[PDB]
């Protein structure tokens, strides 16, 4: 890479960090909530897209985007049936944040309930 400028050999020898996260249970986060989770916010119901079956209470999980990259390693706060059942709640708390902070734009505070609370505030 230094002399020829080819990147295929470096890309061959180096693997993504998400290879270390294969065995974890996945939860898919909306792109609006990705930056909020990177800033240390607890993930909630509106940020949730998909959840893997078999998630238990206080379980190790990985928060991932739709592009497959890993946001954080988190602690699950509701089980799968509780994820399906309720409409409001907290689903995860960030144990270790892996993603860079401003890789995604800041889209929190833009919503019906959020702007309603802002207006009443």
């Amino acid at each position: 890479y230094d002399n020829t400028r080819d990147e295929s050999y470096l890309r061959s020898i180096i693997q993504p960090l998400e290879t270390l996260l294969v065995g974890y249970k996945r939860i898919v986060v909306k792109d609006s909530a990705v930056n909020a989770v990177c800033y240390g916010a607890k993930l909630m119901i509106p940020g949730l897209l998909r959840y893997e079956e078999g998630i238990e209470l206080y379980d190790e999980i990985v928060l991932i985007t739709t592009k497959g990259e890993a946001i954080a390693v988190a602690i699950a706060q509701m089980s799968t049936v509780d994820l399906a059942s309720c409409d409001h709640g907290v689903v995860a708390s960030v144990k270790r944040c892996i993603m860079e902070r401003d890789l995604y734009p800041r889209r929190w505070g833009l919503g019906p309930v959020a702007q309603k609370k802002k207006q009443m505030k």
């Binding site: 990147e7 470096l10 693997q15 290879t19 897209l49 998909r50 990985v62 592009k67 497959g68």
Partner: protein, 57 residues
């Protein structure tokens, strides 16, 4: 003539051959399919070399 006909033979999606952390994506239960994607970020294998090495093992 060669025209793609309605209901022709085509490959359906197979998440088993999908890359790391996207494998078996159909097995995840769907809370909602209605969302607006944000054109930001990158796939883990498709990062630029600085971000690929900085995120590499």
């Amino acid at each position: 003539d060669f025209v793609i006909k309605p209901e022709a033979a085509g490959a359906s999606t197979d998440t088993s051959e999908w890359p790391l952390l996207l494998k078996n994506f159909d097995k995840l239960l769907v809370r909602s399919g209605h969302y607006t994607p944000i054109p930001a970020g990158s796939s883990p294998l498709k990062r630029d070399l600085k971000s690929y090495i900085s995120s590499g093992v």
